[PDB]
């Protein structure tokens, strides 16, 4: 299939150009809302954990596929292992508001605490890259006596204006791994 | 919509489970991918 | 009395990919309006099909230059998505988070030489089972496509999914496969005063390209 | 009991035909799958008989001496040229095993088509009847005819690394040369692939 | 308030044969197509009825040879599925994983002698309660069937289910039963020049054969 | 009932040939989906357990009745006693993917963890015998800090092209066991 | 179908409980066992 390659219109070619037939596709694993709706762990601080999604590592699945977008919308789901009582404050709250139990405070029950947090930012969408370290937009903050594990989960995820993904660069021709297989 | 697979409706209302959307007054790359030129440009012989 | 239940063992543990939702704590929050924002994408394969990205060759360049000597092999690589030529594409950046794929991979060959520089190229698919060809006369017995430069500069070739299984792996762990899923072979046939000009090549997903079983290994 | 079977331009007529055993299916499964994207071709020139010496059945051979023939075999015809030209193939098998003595011999053979016969024991030879099989009893017949389709974990197979079918021939009763019988019976195979399909043509060596 | 329940003691433990299912963790996975594959079997008794397998005798052979002497007993064994003659059959290989059975057991007697060798055989069923016969004239007062060789080589006899209970055990533990469920008695009546030829015998499940109460003891 | 015994057509004989009557049968215990839908234990490794069904012993019920088939299809059910957090990766994944919690990870709750795993192989059916130790096809892999007990359960089981079953060979005429019975 | 005996429908959808089958375009030994010759071959006297 010849075309004007500089016009940047999307041009796809099929196998039917040389006598094949294009088959059916199931793309339910590469859609945005499905693939981002899973927990990813971040390294927590000792007490105060500002909840923004740039604490996710960039080499993880949710981190890299999150940083694929320029803009995003999500509600948040957090699962915290903590000592004492976990306290959440929304976006724009002072840090002394983290010392009050009238703010949403989940008392300790073993082994962890799983709670749903809404979108509390004053912006219509958030950003992965801000021209202007982006602006102080986040999902509030939590604190306990100590926080040992902190998980995020993006739900109702929407993404806008895609940005590059980079795979690992091999030293030889192919990047080889040890794919799991039985010994015998 | 996402990674949810329960068939029983939720115990909590929609006002307390999620943030509610507001109207004013997928989705571009679906139309940009569907508008891809798929055939041939010249005159196909044989 | 009250309703008796049996609290079953093995059930209720926190699984990081469960279809359940958490309990709310902070109700009736209304969002700012968000309708008709530009650039909405709902599936990563939509932007993988609609937007091709460049390949990589030796010297870290997205192009390949026409050689003028006896051996006329221009480029050659594998149908691993973990190949070194595919390593800077968006399609491999998606394919590193999935274990299996299926379908067609489109390659876009557009020619950036002057108007007095002509060339004729050949793209071939060597299936796995024997070693790939070194000559275009040997690759003429494959599935191939031949084209030449002119008014239309870009030529799109659709590398087909030929395999025994209907899904193919996106990597090897480390140990050993030889060069499974075959080879992509770029050859030049003729050139007229095309000494040292560039043929740049993009890669994108086909129409029936699908990519399943999400995984997280490393390297964001 | 006269039966004439024909593949391509090759004909085989027998007069001791107890029947044809269709194993595991009578028809072929779905050929055009999603794994080759419609790039298939049926080769009508490759579905014809080829011959193979199998073993020689004598009196010293007791119960359970097997002969295994992994299909496909070394083939110098068109079907052999299909394996060096294409990456993926698909076929069933039409197997016709002859053991010609006379009706004054005794003993009994069991011919069977076994899928993926990679290892065999002694005791499970006792259950070789679980596979598509016929008996060759020189009292009655000298011809066994077994027709069978393609099986596998993949719908197309690459035959240079995997051979799915195995023709096993087993002595279930030893041969006798009662005073007018034949002293030994040379056992022959007459095999023809059915409904072959190729995909993914190779580069040449020229 | 909220709905009160009583968490009952004794309920909810993990039982390895419960009718409950586990909780999912990894959703919307579509399989490759699998319709119209050859060789589908849904019940093990379907392949036990449709496919007979050989018996075993002394010398580890599936046949029995015609003796030419005064005593004319050819084979004799028990209606235990754990018998030594039944031990290499598929029917005993199923019956080792079940404690009870019921119904008919088919035996297939096909004759592999030459065309100048004739014979006449007799199969008899000795019910339990007294010791089994040694002579065909003594076994003529049983349930028996007599046949001779000819153009049709195979003769199928259906050993019936005669018992006090409607289900019978498939083994003894180790201790003692005498020879319960009786005996199968193979006799030859006459032979003409059949000296040393083979009569091979298969065994399979009957039409009303059923096999219940699954168990795992040992020996895969 | 006389026939041609060498033609290998299925021939059944009844008791009605000698004046009996054939009775009704209940075969709900010898069907494939029922008898294979039960847990069977395998010997686990210390941390990494590649989930394939040839880890089942061949003398068990599910192992021998599994190895009765040439081809099979099943979803999988696993019950694991483990220390730490149990992590599952699908078929084709690297082993370093077993070190990440974004993959399906069931946190520890006493006494065990019971979870359902789909069919993740790229083949239409799996194999008990491969002509070519079969090829690397499996149900993924799991790992924890240590795994003490590992149970499988085949659900929606389908079998194709049956293969031999062998009972134990007795030394005397009958294989005798001690069947459970009261002493008195 | 297998060893399941609950009468209440499942809480999870079919997309999350099992793998979903795909059509293209029991079961042989049931037909092979049902096609078994059951009568007699010769001429039955008495």
Numbering used by the authors:
A (entry chain A), F (entry chain A): 1 to 132, 159 to 210
B (entry chain D), G (entry chain D): 15 to 39, 65 to 85
C (entry chain C), E (entry chain C): 1 to 220
D (entry chain B): 13 to 218
Task: Please share excerpts from the published article on this structure.
FMDV, a small non-enveloped RNA virus (genus Aphthovirus, family Picornaviridae), exists as seven antigenically distinct serotypes and many variants and sub-types. Structures of several serotypes determined at near atomic resolution have revealed a capsid composed of 60 copies each of four structural proteins (VP1 to VP4). A prominent feature of this otherwise rather smooth capsid is an exposed flexible loop (∼30 residues) on VP1, termed the GH loop. This loop and the RGD motif embedded within it (residues 145–147 in the O serotype) comprise a major site of neutralization by the host humoral immune response and mediate FMDV binding integrin89101112.
Initially for both viruses 2 mM Mg2+ was included in the incubation mixture. For all experiments, the micrographs clearly showed bound integrin and no evidence of capsid dissociation. Conventional single particle analysis assuming icosahedral symmetry, yielded density maps for the complexes with the virus capsids at 3.1 Å resolution for PanAsia (13,438 particles) and 3.5 Å for O1M (1,649 particles). In both cases the integrin density was visible but very blurred. Comparison of the PanAsia virus capsid with a high-resolution X-ray structure determined here of native PanAsia confirmed that the integrin had not significantly altered the virus structure, except for the GH loop of VP1, which contains the RGD. In most O serotype viruses, including PanAsia, a disulphide bond bridges residues 134 of VP1 and 130 of VP2, causing the loop to become disordered.
